[PDB]
Amino acid sequence: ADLKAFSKHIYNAYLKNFNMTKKKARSILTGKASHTAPFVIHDIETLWQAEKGLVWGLPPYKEISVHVFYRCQCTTVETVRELTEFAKSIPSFSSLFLNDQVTLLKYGVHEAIFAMLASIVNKDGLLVANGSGFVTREFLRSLRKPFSDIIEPKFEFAVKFNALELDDSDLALFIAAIILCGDRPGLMNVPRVEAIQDTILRALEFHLQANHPDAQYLFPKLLQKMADLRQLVTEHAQMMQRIKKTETETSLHPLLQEIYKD
Numbered sequence: 001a002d003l004k005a006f007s008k009h010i011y012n013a014y015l016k017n018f019n020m021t022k023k024k025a026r027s028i029l030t031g032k033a034s035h036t037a038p039f040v041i042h043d044i045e046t047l048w049q050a051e052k053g054l055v056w057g058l059p060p061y062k063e064i065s066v067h068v069f070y071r072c073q074c075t076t077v078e079t080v081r082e083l084t085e086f087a088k089s090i091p092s093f094s095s096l097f098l099n100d101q102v103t104l105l106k107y108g109v110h111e112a113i114f115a116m117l118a119s120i121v122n123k124d125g126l127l128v129a130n131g132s133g134f135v136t137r138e139f140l141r142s143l144r145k146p147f148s149d150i151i152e153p154k155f156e157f158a159v160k161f162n163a164l165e166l167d168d169s170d171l172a173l174f175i176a177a178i179i180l181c182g183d184r185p186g187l188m189n190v191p192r193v194e195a196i197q198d199t200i201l202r203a204l205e206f207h208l209q210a211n212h213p214d215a216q217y218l219f220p221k222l223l224q225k226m227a228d229l230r231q232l233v234t235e236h237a238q239m240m241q242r243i244k245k246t247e248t249e250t251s252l253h254p255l256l257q258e259i260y261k262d
């Protein structure tokens with residue numbers, strides 16, 4: 001009965017802390033938010049114009065693939081910051097000891113990052129710089145290995161995910177469900193976390209039958225997506241290890257070194 005209130009507070013935490021909603025993202029991608037459109041980045045020259053000021057600091061320069069890799073890090077570290085504030089706005093999360101909070105964010109943020117990335121992605125590319133840019137998938141494909149191999153799987157997941165047609169209120173509960181996961185290694189108060197997760201799942205199962213009355217099997221499809229996200233992030237972490245090993249001139253932000261340390 002109270003699930004509607006617990007879930008409303010999660011929605012508010014979502015709207016207060018995340019830079020862009022799926023709502024705002026889809027209106028830009030479809031040309032319904034402004035009479036100015038995102039600047040399309042599809043090669044070195046458009047990339048250079050975007051950096052020069054059209055659209056928008058980092059470690060010293062090295063090459064274009066690496067440059068784009070540093071822009072991906074900057075966006076992930078920033079999204080880690082929004083996920084930390086989102087999580088702390090969930091009272092039951094803030095009741096956990098600080099070390100359990102860190103353990104859940106450490107192993108959950110990338111799963112949650114890649115779930116939210118679908119919102120800014122279509123089959124042809126994705127938005128950057130708060131919607132001022134659009135970077136083409138074909139450009140990101142043209143990057144040299146291993147940087148194109150770490151990017152392209154996220155588009156595959158994103159286009160299938162977007163076929164579920166979730167709105168921001170669905171996503172807020174789904175993200176909370178990914179972060180409050182009782183399985184993370186070294187978790188201290190596991191029973192307390194599992195109870196929170198279960199509450200969010202029940203809130204989510206209720207929310208879907210109200211918001212998507214005609215979509216059947218959506219809840220078990222979303223549970224499957226959470227299992228798919230765990231595997232996508234396992235493969236992402238393996239690809240990050242190879243970059244650490246073979247791309248020695250490429251630096252990793254220190255906060256990402258901590259997440260990938262284990």
Ligand SMILES: O=C(O)CCCCCOc1ccccc1CN(C(=O)c1ccc(-c2cccnc2)cc1)C1CC1
Nearest residue numbers: 068071072073075076113117128135150151154240256
């Ligand atoms: O392991 C880590 O934590 C760091 C390593 C991540 C490496 C893989 O990152 C991927 C993969 C697929 C899709 C999106 C991203 C990065 N993201 C971007 O929004 C993003 C930002 C800027 C550009 C960009 C800017 C300028 C010119 N060209 C491209 C493109 C994409 C989302 C945060 C995930």
Ligand SMILES: CCCCCCCO[C@@H]1O[C@H](CO)[C@@H](O)[C@H](O)[C@H]1O
Nearest residue numbers: 080084102105106255258259261262
């Ligand atoms: C900002 C929230 C995201 C934080 C994710 C980074 C977690 O790094 C971990 O921080 C712990 C210190 O508490 C260390 O003990 C671990 O060795 C380290 O892996």
